[PDB]
Amino acid sequence: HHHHHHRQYNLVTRESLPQALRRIEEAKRIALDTETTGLQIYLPGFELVGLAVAVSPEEAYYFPYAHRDFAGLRYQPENLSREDLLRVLELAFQRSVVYHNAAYDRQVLYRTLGIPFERSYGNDTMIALHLMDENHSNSLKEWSKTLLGLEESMPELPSLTDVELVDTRKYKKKVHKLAPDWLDRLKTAFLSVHNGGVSFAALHKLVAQAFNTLKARGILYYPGSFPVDFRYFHVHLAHIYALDDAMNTLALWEHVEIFLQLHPQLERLYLDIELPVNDIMTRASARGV
Ligand SMILES: Cc1cn([C@H]2C[C@H](O)[C@@H](COP(=O)(O)O)O2)c(=O)[nH]c1=O
Ligand SMILES: [Cl-]
Ligand SMILES: [Cl-]
Ligand SMILES: [Cl-]
Ligand SMILES: [Cl-]
Ligand SMILES: [Mg+2]
Ligand SMILES: [Mg+2]
Ligand SMILES: [Tb+3]
């Protein structure tokens, strides 16, 4: 685990899974966010990579499911099993659930884990916030800046290699070696711009920059460019990104229930029309629109 400015980020492992279940079980309201291989849920090869679960706006659990190590480096933790994630989801759905874009997450959970839409149903900050400000962007990062007061951030990577002089004519050649602490150096570059709501593009820029710097120094080789694939994003960085989405969604929900209490006209519009219609459209895409 890691505490970064009032927020507790927990990376779940097989060992720490029972504590994560104890914290979810204790929560009256949770937020769910899915991390995946792309925006198209119905493309062959689509996968759920990890699940973010916030038990409060300052406490969350990341459940790695299909993360992988890229270009021969060793940095990912051990992924949790399908049964482990289904235990998490059985527990999660026994309390109130909040999403930011429930149509995406619920279709991901159905397609990849077979979670019925009946259990999946929950609140959606993206729908309720559209009733607060119709002209505002649907982006969770953008709404976090507006209501939660997150600072603007739109990544300067340190040297991940140490130069060693190696006896080789009769001279000393400069050979770059991967620094033993390269992961802590990479986390430091990430933390120096971490505002509590770092964007996907920014996370990918740093991850890509990390691998490209190592490829440009002969440390590793991969054919082509660095893929826009969350499976390869270093979990010790990516779990912070994913967990902030879950914590921002729950923090935004606190603001939403205040707004809906002051406007029961919009609360009724949200509960009787918006959320049910969105559920209808979500189930229809899962069959084929
Ligand atoms: C924001 C974004 C997300 N995605 C995919 C990967 C993410 O793991 C998944 C969930 O997005 P999220 O980070 O907003 O929850 O959607 C993209 O493929 N491109 C994007 O620009
Ligand atoms: Cl895609
Ligand atoms: Cl695996
Ligand atoms: Cl169903
Ligand atoms: Cl040389
Ligand atoms: Mg999401
Ligand atoms: Mg996310
Ligand atoms: Tb309420």
Author numbering: 0 to 153, 157 to 170, 176 to 296
Source paper text:
The structure of PolI_G20c was solved with the aid of the structure of an exonuclease termed ExnV1, which was determined in parallel in this work and originates from an Icelandic virus metagenome collected from several hot springs in Iceland. The gene coding for ExnV1 may be part of a truncated gene that originally encoded a DNA polymerase I. A novel structural motif, SβαR, that was not previously associated with DNA polymerases I was identified in the solved structures of ExnV1 and PolI_G20c. Residues 152–185 are missing in chain B of PolI_G20c; however, the residues corresponding to those in ExnV1 are present and from the sequence alignment it is interpreted that PolI_G20c also resembles ExnV1 in this area, which is part of a novel structure motif (SβαR) that is discussed further below. The major difference between the two proteins is that ExnV1 only comprises the smaller 3′–5′ exonuclease, whereas PolI_G20c also includes the larger palm domain that is responsible for the polymerase activity. The SβαR structural motif consists of two β-strands followed by two α-helices that are connected to each other via a short β-strand.
